Design a binder for these strands. Structure first.
Ligand SMILES: [Mg+2]
Ligand SMILES: [Mg+2]
Ligand SMILES: [Mg+2]
Ligand SMILES: [Mg+2]
Ligand SMILES: [Mg+2]
Ligand SMILES: [Mg+2]
Ligand SMILES: [Mg+2]
Ligand SMILES: [Mg+2]
Ligand SMILES: [Mg+2]
Ligand SMILES: [Mg+2]
Ligand SMILES: [Mg+2]
Ligand SMILES: [Mg+2]
Ligand SMILES: [Mg+2]
Ligand SMILES: [Mg+2]
Ligand SMILES: [Mg+2]
Ligand SMILES: [Mg+2]
Ligand SMILES: [Mg+2]
Ligand SMILES: [Mg+2]
Ligand SMILES: [Mg+2]
Ligand SMILES: [Mg+2]
Ligand SMILES: [Mg+2]
Ligand SMILES: [Mg+2]
Ligand SMILES: [Mg+2]
Ligand SMILES: [Mg+2]
Ligand SMILES: [Mg+2]
Ligand SMILES: [Mg+2]
Ligand SMILES: [Mg+2]
Ligand SMILES: [Mg+2]
Ligand SMILES: [Mg+2]
Ligand SMILES: [Mg+2]
Ligand SMILES: [Mg+2]
Ligand SMILES: [Mg+2]
Ligand SMILES: [Mg+2]
Ligand SMILES: [Mg+2]
Ligand SMILES: [Mg+2]
Ligand SMILES: [Mg+2]
Ligand SMILES: [Mg+2]
Ligand SMILES: [Mg+2]
Ligand SMILES: [Mg+2]
Ligand SMILES: [Mg+2]
Ligand SMILES: [Mg+2]
Ligand SMILES: [Mg+2]
Ligand SMILES: [Mg+2]
Ligand SMILES: [Mg+2]
Ligand SMILES: [Mg+2]
Ligand SMILES: [Mg+2]
Ligand SMILES: [Mg+2]
Ligand SMILES: [Mg+2]
Ligand SMILES: [Mg+2]
Ligand SMILES: [Mg+2]
Ligand SMILES: [Mg+2]
Ligand SMILES: [Mg+2]
Ligand SMILES: [Mg+2]
Ligand SMILES: [Mg+2]
Ligand SMILES: [Mg+2]
Ligand SMILES: [Mg+2]
Ligand SMILES: [Mg+2]
Ligand SMILES: [Mg+2]
Ligand SMILES: [Mg+2]
Ligand SMILES: [Mg+2]
Ligand SMILES: [Mg+2]
Ligand SMILES: [Mg+2]
Ligand SMILES: [Mg+2]
Ligand SMILES: [Mg+2]
Ligand SMILES: [Mg+2]
Ligand SMILES: [Mg+2]
Ligand SMILES: [Mg+2]
Ligand SMILES: [Mg+2]
Ligand SMILES: [Mg+2]
Ligand SMILES: [Mg+2]
Ligand SMILES: [Mg+2]
Ligand SMILES: [Mg+2]
Ligand SMILES: [Mg+2]
Ligand SMILES: [Mg+2]
Ligand SMILES: [Mg+2]
Ligand SMILES: [Mg+2]
Ligand SMILES: [Mg+2]
Ligand SMILES: [Mg+2]
Ligand SMILES: [Mg+2]
Ligand SMILES: [Mg+2]
Ligand SMILES: [Mg+2]
Ligand SMILES: [Mg+2]
Ligand SMILES: [Mg+2]
Ligand SMILES: [Mg+2]
Ligand SMILES: [Mg+2]
Ligand SMILES: [Mg+2]
Ligand SMILES: [Mg+2]
Ligand SMILES: [Mg+2]
Ligand SMILES: [Mg+2]
Ligand SMILES: [Mg+2]
Ligand SMILES: [Mg+2]
Ligand SMILES: [Mg+2]
Ligand SMILES: [Mg+2]
Ligand SMILES: [Mg+2]
Ligand SMILES: [Mg+2]
Ligand SMILES: [Mg+2]
Ligand SMILES: [Mg+2]
Ligand SMILES: [Mg+2]
Ligand SMILES: [Mg+2]
Ligand SMILES: [Mg+2]
Ligand SMILES: [Mg+2]
Ligand SMILES: [Mg+2]
Ligand SMILES: [Mg+2]
Ligand SMILES: [Mg+2]
Ligand SMILES: [Mg+2]
Ligand SMILES: [Mg+2]
Ligand SMILES: [Mg+2]
Ligand SMILES: [Mg+2]
Ligand SMILES: [Mg+2]
Ligand SMILES: [Mg+2]
Ligand SMILES: [Mg+2]
Ligand SMILES: [Mg+2]
Ligand SMILES: [Mg+2]
Ligand SMILES: [Mg+2]
Ligand SMILES: [Mg+2]
Ligand SMILES: [Mg+2]
Ligand SMILES: [Mg+2]
Ligand SMILES: [Mg+2]
Ligand SMILES: [Mg+2]
Ligand SMILES: [Mg+2]
Ligand SMILES: [Mg+2]
Ligand SMILES: [Mg+2]
Ligand SMILES: [Mg+2]
Ligand SMILES: [Mg+2]
Ligand SMILES: [Mg+2]
Ligand SMILES: [Mg+2]
Ligand SMILES: [Mg+2]
Ligand SMILES: [Mg+2]
Ligand SMILES: [Mg+2]
Ligand SMILES: [Mg+2]
Ligand SMILES: [Mg+2]
Ligand SMILES: [Mg+2]
Ligand SMILES: [Mg+2]
Ligand SMILES: [Mg+2]
Ligand SMILES: [Mg+2]
Ligand SMILES: [Mg+2]
Length: 68
RNA sequence: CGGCUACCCACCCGACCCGUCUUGAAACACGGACCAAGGAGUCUAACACGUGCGCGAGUCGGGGGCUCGCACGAAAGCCGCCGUGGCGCAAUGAAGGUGAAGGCCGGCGCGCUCGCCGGCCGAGGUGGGAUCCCGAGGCCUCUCCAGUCCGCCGAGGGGCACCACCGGCCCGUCUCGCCCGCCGCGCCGGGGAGGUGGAGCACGAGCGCACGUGUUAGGACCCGAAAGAUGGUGAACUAUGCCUGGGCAGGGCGAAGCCAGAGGAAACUCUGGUGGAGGUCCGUAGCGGUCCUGACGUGCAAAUCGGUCGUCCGACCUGGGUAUAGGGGCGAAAGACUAAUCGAACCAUCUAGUAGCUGGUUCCCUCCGAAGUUUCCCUCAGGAUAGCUGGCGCUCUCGCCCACGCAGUUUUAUCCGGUAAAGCGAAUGAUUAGAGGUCUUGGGGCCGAAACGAUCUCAACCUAUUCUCAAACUUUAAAUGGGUAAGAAGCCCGGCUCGCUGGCGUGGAGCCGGGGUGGAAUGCGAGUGCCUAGUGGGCCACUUUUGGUAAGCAGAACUGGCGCUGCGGGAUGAACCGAACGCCGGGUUAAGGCGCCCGAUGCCGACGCUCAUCAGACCCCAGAAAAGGUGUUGGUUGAUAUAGACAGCAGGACGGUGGCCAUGGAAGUCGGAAUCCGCUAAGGAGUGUGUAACAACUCACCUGCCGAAUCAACUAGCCCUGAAAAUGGAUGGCGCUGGAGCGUCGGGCCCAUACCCGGCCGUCGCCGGCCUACGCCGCGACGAGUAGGAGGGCCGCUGCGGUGAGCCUUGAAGCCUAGGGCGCGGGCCCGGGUGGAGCCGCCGCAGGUGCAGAUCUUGGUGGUAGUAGCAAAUAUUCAAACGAGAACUUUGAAGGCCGAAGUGGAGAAGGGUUCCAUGUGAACAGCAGUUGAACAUGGGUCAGUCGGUCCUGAGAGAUGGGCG
RNA sequence: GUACCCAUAUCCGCAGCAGGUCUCCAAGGUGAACAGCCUCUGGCAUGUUGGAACAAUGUAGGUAAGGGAAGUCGGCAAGC
RNA sequence: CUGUUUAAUUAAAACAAAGCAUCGCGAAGGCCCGCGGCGGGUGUUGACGCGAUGUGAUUUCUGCCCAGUGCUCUGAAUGUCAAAGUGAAGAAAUUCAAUGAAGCGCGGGUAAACGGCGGGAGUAACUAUGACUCUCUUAAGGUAGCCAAAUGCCUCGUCAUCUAAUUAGUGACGCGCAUGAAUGGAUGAACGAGAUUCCCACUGUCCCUACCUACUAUCCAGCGAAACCACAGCCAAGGGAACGGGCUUGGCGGAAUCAGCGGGGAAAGAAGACCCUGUUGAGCUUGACUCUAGUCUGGCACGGUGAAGAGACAUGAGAGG
RNA sequence: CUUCUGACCUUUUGGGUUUUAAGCAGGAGGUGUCAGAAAAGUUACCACAGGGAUAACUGGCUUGUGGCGGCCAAGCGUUCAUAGCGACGUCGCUUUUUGAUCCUUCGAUGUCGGCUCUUCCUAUCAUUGUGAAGCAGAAUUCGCCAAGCGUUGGAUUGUUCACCCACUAAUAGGGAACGUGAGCUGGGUUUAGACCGUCGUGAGACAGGUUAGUUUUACCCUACUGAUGAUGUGUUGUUGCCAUGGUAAUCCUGCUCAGUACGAGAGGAACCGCAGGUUCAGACAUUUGGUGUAUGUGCUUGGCUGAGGAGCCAAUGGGGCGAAGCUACCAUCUGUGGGAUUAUGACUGAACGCCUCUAAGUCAGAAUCCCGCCCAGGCGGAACGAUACGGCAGCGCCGCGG
């Protein structure tokens, strides 16, 4: 009882009925697969930022506000 | 007079018989003779999602108890120190076990890749984010003054839910090291910084009840097996033993034994009788069944009958009793018989056994609407997964010089590739021929004792060319096609963090802060979550292609179509050409067509081709080739002709030379090579016929007459030959020839459910109004559809709780009806006629709720059809009586059959009143009946000496005892 | 217990079914004979119906001139 | 040979038969029944008997192979080998070791047990074929017989007879795909409701059909079904699920009927006995898988007393390398 | 599941130690049907649910193969390509062979061959009319229009096929579901019994061979054959036409021609005419033969009526003859012509000064076509006769008014 083996007929119609839209592009996609050393350095820079940010950046903001 | 309709008839057009398996159904595929009733997705437990309700970090009394005995009460009410308990509120490890709060500010110890302290609120930050808040600005009678009065908005802020990311916390692990504590200073505990695994935490949402869908276990939508197990019943048929009885006409052959006679010296032999044996022969009764493959073959018969057969003293046939009973018995063995069933009986139960397999599966309308494909499976007639589909939503966006976002598309930049084509005087592999050079090699000829001492040639090698090819070759290389980008998620500027890297404040990432959106065209509203049926056999077509000679063959790529689909043309039709579908009126048209079927050329239509004794007449499509035509109609390349051709008529057609090679003959004429010469006006060492050769005819050539065009080869349009198949017959038919054929066209005309305008119905979107708000309006765009998914029903059936101060013996339900009428529809209302005691509307509730099929179950009725059939065994007739009725009864007579192995007289088994008498004649008797073995009534079986009872036979059987 | 059928009509086979079912008695003629045929004692209406005709086909039965198996797979049937 | 056989498609060459052979058994036995018992059949039996097989009148013949598969017999010389029993290590569970019943393995016998019986090369004064000989193989290479057979593919083999003509029949030939010796081979009087060939007489089997008789069939009187039925029935061509009756184009088309007929209705009788699928069954067989009755051995109790003897363990002592 | 490796790890259940076991992580022991069950064969004694998703029939698509043709022309043909063949190449038709695919058929289409019978096809074996030869005659070979008429009797085989004998003008090829099984036959294939050979340990298998092996139903519709009828002409009858459909004739022998034409001989025709015969068709019974139940007559076996005489019975007792009727190629009679034309041969005659059967026009022309003869006569019509007593009637024609 030989039958049909494999065809791709009437497949593009099934695909285009729902759509072949591109994947959802969003900001801050992901951080997976990134170098572990680079990720560790980024975490350290993010967690040590508020130590010196809230003072020197505030002083510079006051200075630029006095400038303009 | 008006009247649609469930009345009948006629014409015009269209019209194949329904249901399901299938790519394909009206099929010469299956089911259906018809009608009435019954008939198929239910219920329980569990799970998932969605919706309604109540409570809410809680929720739930379903389990019990309490009040008072109760028709409604197997209800309802309550427990409150009955919440035991289930679910959720805490997760992570196999386990010992552990087990979730961040942020700001300042200080100190080296504010150290650095802990602690003190104060506060208290679940971080970034980019989006409905909504809300603030808000420059301008919008209302003459004016500076105002609170309401008119009234939107640039920009900015805190930001629900939700989305993405970063960080934070908990549990199990791996690396690194250091610190703290002691009910006891230890292979005792606790803590940190980094990478990972968790169904986690990071202000919680679950619980209980009901409904709908989907999956699953229950017989589980309905009907259906071959089979398996348990426990019992059959030897009245048949197979076999045993016991006890019965039966087998007549003839033929002539075994042993016996007697007599004859022959012989003896042994002995021979002859004629008698004798009556045989698993003997012909043959009857009996027992079986060879052939006619005879008759029947819905029969006499679920195995028979007529001839013809084999055996008939036996291994014979047969009655009764008795023993063996189902994986068993019995078997002169055919797996035959075992109660019409035997390669494993019957009966009841498990059992509604299972089926990936057939068949069926019941009311209407509206909306949406496929797949035969990927992967896996002992998978290929199936299932799971993905995909296609539907439903429920949810989050936002427009609606009062500018949008977020998207696209089977184009435009601009940008790469990617190795097909089509082309090439091999370019790589690789195949490949024909020529030209030159030869270093060498091999085969021939030459000078000559031989010799790379010399020479000619061939093969081989090299060089520059040359002809033809590669899906598994390629320098080069298309079209088509694939990806990306065309902004605010971007750019410029400044400053902080890094434990990453490092000459360097170097590089790179992260964060913060203020300033500047108009960035290719066109079109469009987008995003997202959950549940989910069906599908998982396909087919066809333009083009590209694999195997095959080819196929209406098998297998692929894109797109379209059928299946899932009607309509107008192709006469006919699955795929072709147009075109897609609510009900209508008008106009137009696509494809196609205008001689009649059949609507339209019935145009004073145009140009040209074509004649068939087989014309021709429209993609798929239903017919044909190589080749040929002095049949016509066009074209090309050429050659001749007033220095008079081509055709026709007439004349010449000679000499060297009967030339050289041949020979039985070649003297132009069978052959090989050649092939000239001289006078001429021209004659060819000769185009053909003929002779064995010579002769003869004739031709090339020249000339005489006529007199102006002609000859030859190819090429392509119609037509013709090529062209033969079986029932009579297919441009669709009739037919058509100044066309109704072929080619090129013009102006009109014909009609589709297509287009435009308008009415009506429904869906969707936008909405409008403070008029059943679940109602009433307005505008616009769309309506097909199998499998399947949803919504509505004031469609229908049954019963229950309310309600209609409901209808009815002045007529309920039901049934019938050329009557009226409503709704698109399921259906319903009224009138009339039967009928004689119940029924219905509205609001909710629960179903054993809708039939056209299932070789569906039961019951009834048709065509067949007053048909087949009342024919195995020789045969009936006359008169009379009883009777309404005579062929079937009775009596008499005549003619016949069974003819003693009977169609007679008696019995055993079996039947049980069938035996007898009387009486009726609807039923029985296959017609009839006065008749009967039918019906009703009443009678009938008399035993010491007929048999049972008595006795044992094969055999069955209790106690003693044994086993269980 | 004692009737009756004991059967092509009282049994079984779905029935008044050419089927099946165990025994006794059994004459005369022809003839070897209980073969076949014809009669007597004893039974019967021809087997679930009759009338009219004698077409084809059919079911059983018998002949056919000349040939004699030449038909057929086979001398099947029929025939001697 | 007589006889029996598939009731209801077979009557036979099949089965059976006397005869001829072989196997087991001396009763605490052989072959079987049985859930059970020292229960039952043979057995009211005892080797001229019982039980289990093969071949199949009489005569003559019974060839060669034990390699394999089966059957049987032997020695605790000899390998494998379960429970139970013994010793050792360990606190014990446990582990190790010594020995080891049947069976298997080894060896012998048996083929009237199942079965089998090959293949090359050189050699005769016409040549070939071939008297004769060498060689591989395993256990032995078809002996005596018989044949194109009921056994032969080539084949309708070749020759002779039978015929006018023969794929038939008979006789003979014989590297015979693939005959053959109790798998029985060769004959063979009588008898086959056995199959086949020829001949004589015979006849309607036929040339070549015709006629006659009885019962139907036929019409009528009376009585009266069933099978089947989607609706129903005139054809040609085309398309179509590729062979229509209904569709399209044409040919055409008057009621109701009787007697035959068998071309059609792809006629009826039955969910194809043929082929395939089923993760559907049943019968049967075996060196398919897993089990079991039964059967053969070993151990444990029933199961008790005496004597003699062998092997090992522990004990003290004397020889040895 | 087993084994190994590591923690100076976890649990070994009332609490401790130890053996052991379980537990975590990763390496190995395998699913070759490789996303992974543990698995021999036969059933012809077979069964069930299904499949035309899937073979054995036919039909359908193509024709490789088979058969049948055409073109080119190297050559055969003594000479000479094409009288007759024609290689190397190449182009077509057919489904009378086989093969390829599986489209309809699995709730069945009865599947070989033979017998009987009808029709059709032509790629013609013979017959009618013709052309060409290496056609002197005869016998032959190649084509043209041509299917009207024939294409037999047997030996062996189941056979399709094939071979042989004989006859004949010739013994040609096919189709219709490989025509035809509710027509037959069952010889083989293809069930169940059994035998032999080979294969298999076995059950069993063999497109190997040999034997015996149930052949069911029509009464329905149509078609066909025949018979009543129906429609319309007012009724009925007689005499008549045919529109239409069917269609029948075919072949051979002997004699005169003629031992002639022809041919050197050997050999050896043809036209007209005369006798017939084969097959087929229509009938017919005087003669001949069949049948026979006038149960006509006369013998004869057994029994029966007492015996003669007369008879009867024995499923028409047998047999010798036989009227009438039916019947036989087993006897007898008969079977017939006109037209237009095909193939072909010709006339006049241009295209194309000539030629030419053609281009327009003419001629002859046949088993083929049609009709004539014959068969039945239509939802076809004509010509003629009679047309309703009896007592009241009834029915026609003319003229009529309502
Ligand atoms: Mg598939
Ligand atoms: Mg239905
Ligand atoms: Mg199916
Ligand atoms: Mg199909
Ligand atoms: Mg259908
Ligand atoms: Mg059908
Ligand atoms: Mg059918
Ligand atoms: Mg039916
Ligand atoms: Mg109903
Ligand atoms: Mg609690
Ligand atoms: Mg069942
Ligand atoms: Mg089982
Ligand atoms: Mg039992
Ligand atoms: Mg008995
Ligand atoms: Mg005898
Ligand atoms: Mg004899
Ligand atoms: Mg007899
Ligand atoms: Mg019989
Ligand atoms: Mg019998
Ligand atoms: Mg027989
Ligand atoms: Mg018969
Ligand atoms: Mg009959
Ligand atoms: Mg007899
Ligand atoms: Mg005899
Ligand atoms: Mg006898
Ligand atoms: Mg059993
Ligand atoms: Mg039986
Ligand atoms: Mg059983
Ligand atoms: Mg069920
Ligand atoms: Mg599949
Ligand atoms: Mg979706
Ligand atoms: Mg490529
Ligand atoms: Mg290329
Ligand atoms: Mg296919
Ligand atoms: Mg295809
Ligand atoms: Mg479908
Ligand atoms: Mg669609
Ligand atoms: Mg469509
Ligand atoms: Mg159409
Ligand atoms: Mg197009
Ligand atoms: Mg289109
Ligand atoms: Mg319109
Ligand atoms: Mg048009
Ligand atoms: Mg018109
Ligand atoms: Mg043509
Ligand atoms: Mg067409
Ligand atoms: Mg076609
Ligand atoms: Mg031309
Ligand atoms: Mg025509
Ligand atoms: Mg529309
Ligand atoms: Mg719709
Ligand atoms: Mg109601
Ligand atoms: Mg009343
Ligand atoms: Mg009442
Ligand atoms: Mg119901
Ligand atoms: Mg119904
Ligand atoms: Mg039914
Ligand atoms: Mg009733
Ligand atoms: Mg009826
Ligand atoms: Mg009748
Ligand atoms: Mg009868
Ligand atoms: Mg009277
Ligand atoms: Mg009487
Ligand atoms: Mg008498
Ligand atoms: Mg007697
Ligand atoms: Mg008697
Ligand atoms: Mg009475
Ligand atoms: Mg009666
Ligand atoms: Mg009585
Ligand atoms: Mg009574
Ligand atoms: Mg007395
Ligand atoms: Mg007594
Ligand atoms: Mg007892
Ligand atoms: Mg006791
Ligand atoms: Mg009595
Ligand atoms: Mg009887
Ligand atoms: Mg009887
Ligand atoms: Mg006598
Ligand atoms: Mg006498
Ligand atoms: Mg009578
Ligand atoms: Mg009777
Ligand atoms: Mg005769
Ligand atoms: Mg005679
Ligand atoms: Mg004779
Ligand atoms: Mg003879
Ligand atoms: Mg024969
Ligand atoms: Mg006979
Ligand atoms: Mg017997
Ligand atoms: Mg028989
Ligand atoms: Mg014993
Ligand atoms: Mg013997
Ligand atoms: Mg031997
Ligand atoms: Mg041995
Ligand atoms: Mg032990
Ligand atoms: Mg020699
Ligand atoms: Mg030999
Ligand atoms: Mg012999
Ligand atoms: Mg013969
Ligand atoms: Mg052998
Ligand atoms: Mg041999
Ligand atoms: Mg005679
Ligand atoms: Mg037709
Ligand atoms: Mg056909
Ligand atoms: Mg057709
Ligand atoms: Mg039909
Ligand atoms: Mg119609
Ligand atoms: Mg139609
Ligand atoms: Mg009739
Ligand atoms: Mg008939
Ligand atoms: Mg079936
Ligand atoms: Mg499967
Ligand atoms: Mg079975
Ligand atoms: Mg796999
Ligand atoms: Mg099996
Ligand atoms: Mg058998
Ligand atoms: Mg198919
Ligand atoms: Mg087929
Ligand atoms: Mg049938
Ligand atoms: Mg049929
Ligand atoms: Mg003819
Ligand atoms: Mg046929
Ligand atoms: Mg046979
Ligand atoms: Mg057989
Ligand atoms: Mg002469
Ligand atoms: Mg002469
Ligand atoms: Mg005749
Ligand atoms: Mg006569
Ligand atoms: Mg006569
Ligand atoms: Mg007489
Ligand atoms: Mg007499
Ligand atoms: Mg007398
Ligand atoms: Mg008699
Ligand atoms: Mg007579
Ligand atoms: Mg006579
Ligand atoms: Mg005649
Ligand atoms: Mg002519």
């Amino acid at each position: 009882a030989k039958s049909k083996n494999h065809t791709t007929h009437n497949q593009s119609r099934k695909w285009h009925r729902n759509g072949i839209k591109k994947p959802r592009s969003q900001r801050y996609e992901s951080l997976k697969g990134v170098d572990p050393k680079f990720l560790r350095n980024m975490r350290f820079a993010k967690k040590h930022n508020k130590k010196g940010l809230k003072k020197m950046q505030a002083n510079n903001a006051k200075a630029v506000s006095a400038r303009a």
